[PDB]
Amino acid sequence: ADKLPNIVILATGGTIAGSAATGTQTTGYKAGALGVDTLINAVPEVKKLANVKGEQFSNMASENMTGDVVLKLSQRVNELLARDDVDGVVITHGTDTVEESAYFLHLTVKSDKPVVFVAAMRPATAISADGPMNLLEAVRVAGDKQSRGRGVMVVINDRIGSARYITKTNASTLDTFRANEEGYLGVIIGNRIYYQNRIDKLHTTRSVFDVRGLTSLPKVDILYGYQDDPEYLYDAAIQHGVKGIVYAGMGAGSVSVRGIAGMRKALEKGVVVMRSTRTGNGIVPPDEELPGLVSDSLNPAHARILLMLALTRTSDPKVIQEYFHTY
Amino acid sequence: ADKLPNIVILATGGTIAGSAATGTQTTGYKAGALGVDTLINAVPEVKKLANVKGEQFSNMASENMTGDVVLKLSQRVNELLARDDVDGVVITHGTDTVEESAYFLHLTVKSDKPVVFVAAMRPATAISADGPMNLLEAVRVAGDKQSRGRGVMVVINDRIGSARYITKTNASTLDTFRANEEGYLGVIIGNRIYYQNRIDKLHTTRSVFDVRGLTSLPKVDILYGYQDDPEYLYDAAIQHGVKGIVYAGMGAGSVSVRGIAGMRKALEKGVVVMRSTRTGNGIVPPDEELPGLVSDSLNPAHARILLMLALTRTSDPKVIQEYFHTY
Amino acid sequence: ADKLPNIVILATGGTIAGSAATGTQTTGYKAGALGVDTLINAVPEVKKLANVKGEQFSNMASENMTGDVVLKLSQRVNELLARDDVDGVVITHGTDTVEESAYFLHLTVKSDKPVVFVAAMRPATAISADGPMNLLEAVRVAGDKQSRGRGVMVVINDRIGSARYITKTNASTLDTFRANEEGYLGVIIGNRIYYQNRIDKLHTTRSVFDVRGLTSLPKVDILYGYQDDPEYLYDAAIQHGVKGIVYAGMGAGSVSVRGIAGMRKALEKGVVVMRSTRTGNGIVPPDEELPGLVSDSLNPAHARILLMLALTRTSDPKVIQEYFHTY
Amino acid sequence: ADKLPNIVILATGGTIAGSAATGTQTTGYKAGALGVDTLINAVPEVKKLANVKGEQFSNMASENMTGDVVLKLSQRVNELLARDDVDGVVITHGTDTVEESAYFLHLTVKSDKPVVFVAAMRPATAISADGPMNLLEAVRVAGDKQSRGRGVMVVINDRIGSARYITKTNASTLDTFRANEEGYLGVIIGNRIYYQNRIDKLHTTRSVFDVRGLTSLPKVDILYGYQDDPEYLYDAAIQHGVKGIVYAGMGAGSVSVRGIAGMRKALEKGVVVMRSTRTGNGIVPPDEELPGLVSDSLNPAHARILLMLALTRTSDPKVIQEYFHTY
């Protein structure tokens, strides 16, 4: 029959559910202070777009989001997407680490039904808050049949970005989420969805990563690259038992003599080293003369997520590298 | 003017002086392989723009550029610019940490005479190498009377950027140097300079940072911010006598519970904590509820440079914070 | 008491004063539907930033804004700013042609006091409308002492842009106003203004353009450049008495054999030809082999404004060309 | 044979074949001054990538490229791709109108073999000429198996862009070709191709536009939108037999009272009016209150191309509108 699609709104917190003393206060707010019900009733317009059910998964600032919690989130979403009574899901999340949580599910959700992450740069109590409209757009995207099989998406500021390329580029602006080199999957203007691209990477239903029946993930830390970068930080990470290290290198994953010494100690202890870049965009090309693997176009935050997942399936450097060139 | 300006080209290495086997080889090249006079000979046209004098300062990949060497570089430039027969200086440098070295001199050179950093993204032996034209443009800028009193500049890909805003945004493209929110100071088109902006920040002749006689600088490290970031990294830093820590935080310098724990410790040990952002662009706003100071619009790399210089003359947070809003 | 500045809000119309049936409507609304006092009572917080006075100059969609009206707007603003009891002016305007009106005042307002144009991409009745925050920020900018002598500004989406460089780059998004190559003058984050640049161009008090006493402006049209562009469009413009033709050319003001024949007819008939570009950004360089003058980095819309004003003072091509390189 | 792919390089002219008096001459050169054999011999490295055959289709500046010539270019490419011995085609073209010629073929080439347009912003005789590397990259893309079925591509400055989205955004820089909202299809770094997106639009083999046997195309002109735009330009176009009019309007295709009057006249004369935008990016949404059709995300230059082709199929408004949402 012809009816509204069933959409589940899984809330986890963030500024979209945050609040402040006044409406002119755009900073210094308490993220995750509003229930999913509060948000839904704020935009009753969504009712006209679909049959929505709110579910409070958690209510925290995204900076406190952890791998174990994200792992649980992926499992719950897989549970929901399995039901014939669920057409898609919308996940309210904080903007700070949404690219990390979104990319994790992008790789582990075994369904082509739309999984849409939504966020807000201004608190719900702010003048001209962006949450209401973003939420409304997220629902329209999750309920549209065109949205299936496109991988996990992030909806905000009228844009639809792929979890694989989208990233928070600005610390405090509404238009912070961009994919400089890759663009948006589509845009929402005048309540109409305009799809532009389909990412040419593996994801969701065609991903080899399955975290169902998984308690925890391999430990992976991120080290920065800069003039005078200390060798002792590598020592600290190795000692606390990291399984992998993502290096946010200078330029195209360039390493100083101190970083090179630190990386070899790591390779010696069976620790996998992934060279990425601190620049923000671009491809870190292969270089047989430098230690470790290369992150392709994945930024540090994204690389870590994929490295953690890769280690749950293999230790083979050659296999992990290809993962980074295809996911 | 009838008189050709006197320009000193100070070479330090980089890909602009990089060499590879084939012309099609753009990666895995040997940085700092060619001498300064060899670059000048490769572009004889520069001799028509000014009376150039090449001086080899060093010849290494910029990833290995260290604070003590940058310190000496700044003292050498101050030295030359004091001479009445030197109108401008052009410094060939690697692209990887040029934004760090450039910003340092931007704060320590006590002259209004042009100081121009030039670099290249493709080795000198590559097909369509960008170095030749970048060098020619840099000399033109350094020899132009209009270029005085604009602060330290970085010339590349026909663009003129301020050392305070410019950054390498892409790991491998020729158009990698950009200032998304601040734009360029000017552009060079058709052998003509078009100046567009003047930065509204303190620098050079108006800076309080005097580095005469110094041989070393305060130790400052950078820690990344992400999901599951470890507290032990802060312990390690503190244990190795750092004077300040620059945090490349999630979003607007947001800190996780673990990060906050580590920061409290650092603060107790008298370590200065500067909260910046990993996003790439934007303002990290003040927040009395969170620990440490804020980096204004300075990214991690630039933040570290200003913090090191600030610590050479003060440890009072109120004063350091002010520096970050004015420099 | 020693406090609040005096700001006059001149309303001309625009979507910022536009209204639709429901909040779900962001298109198909009516610009210039709400009164100025209605906009003020809508954002009472503005009254805690300054002593505001509202004035209804007009109420129309900006696509209908005309030279004669912009001329009067300029004259009215000059009278207003001459008073000792007026510290600055905020002008609400539609987004479609605000860059034209804003640049006109940029060249004709003879005062250092702040002139801030503000607009909105969404109608006042829309969910997550941007008008309120935009207006609040415009008033804060106009009332700040640091804002004097920076030229006419356009405030929207937390950004402050110069009328000389800013332009609407996207047809429907909130972050449409950008200056790709020149950046923003500053940004407003967390109720604080962060100035970054000062434009290196003549404007306001250093401008030679005086429109006081003027009642009409020279006719100037814009013709597009593209494959198979018709010569007859030039004949039509000439026949209708245009004094100047702004050419939104292909690439760097390149002309086809048909456009060249057209420009030559124009020149032979006393019409001043200005070659700009349809690309959207950059420098159209001088070319001794092509007819007409070049627009520097002025886009077609801005170039038309300057050419119109230039013609009220001279018809000397040498002088007009110099205007384009300095304003 | 040789196991190397067979690539035909079809030369049409352009700066990539441009020649200037001096090496410092990046402007004021002669587009289409060299032959196809000279280009191939200039960069013999291409012969290591594939067995190349050169063909001088023409040699002109792209500003002079006309529809009748593009028509023949399309027909010629179709017969070349029909052969067993042709794996891909590389077309050298001036940058000024490459987006127009490229989009035309994008819609009319009935093959899935790669069709790659390549150009250069600096003349062949310029210091750091970009042409050599651009060509080398174009040949690599055209010969790669991953490249088929991606639609027509434009390769330049290490980027691979789709003919439907790419556009010349800057008048004189090397990094001028961008697709702000849609990103690039892929990038070439270290002699390796990294594909990012597949466009979600109809093209090539799935296009209903066939130009076999056609010698002429319907006439379509472009009119600009700005304050005080004249109605007489519409009358002029109508009087000269245009079948279509593309309007590069203000904002989201906004029209002034004069533009509307002119548009209504054209419609009553059977002229198809297509409202696009002068802004440079974005969606022109549908609007019942305004006359004519909307261009979706196509800019004026692209819109003209699709409208001409649509008119070779039908004049029905609803069908043409659908073409604009799917191509």
UniProtKB/Swiss-Prot annotation, chains A, B, C, D:
- Additional remarks: The sequence of strain NCPPB 1066 is shown.
Q: Which organism is it from?
A: Dickeya chrysanthemi
Keyword set, alphabetical order: Hydrolase, Pharmaceutical, Signal
Q: Which PROSITE patterns does the UniProt record give?
A: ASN_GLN_ASE_1, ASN_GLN_ASE_2, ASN_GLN_ASE_3
The record's active-site residues are: T15
Which InterPro entries does the UniProt entry name for this protein? AsnASE_II, Asp/glu_Ase-like_sf, Asparaginase/glutaminase-like, Asparaginase/glutaminase_AS1, Asparaginase/glutaminase_AS2, Asparaginase_C, L-asparaginase_C, L-asparaginase_N
CDD domains linked: L-asparaginase_like
Q: What is this protein called?
A: L-asparaginase
Q: What Enzyme Commission number(s) apply to this enzyme?
A: 3.5.1.1
Domain named Asparaginase/glutaminase is located at: 5-327
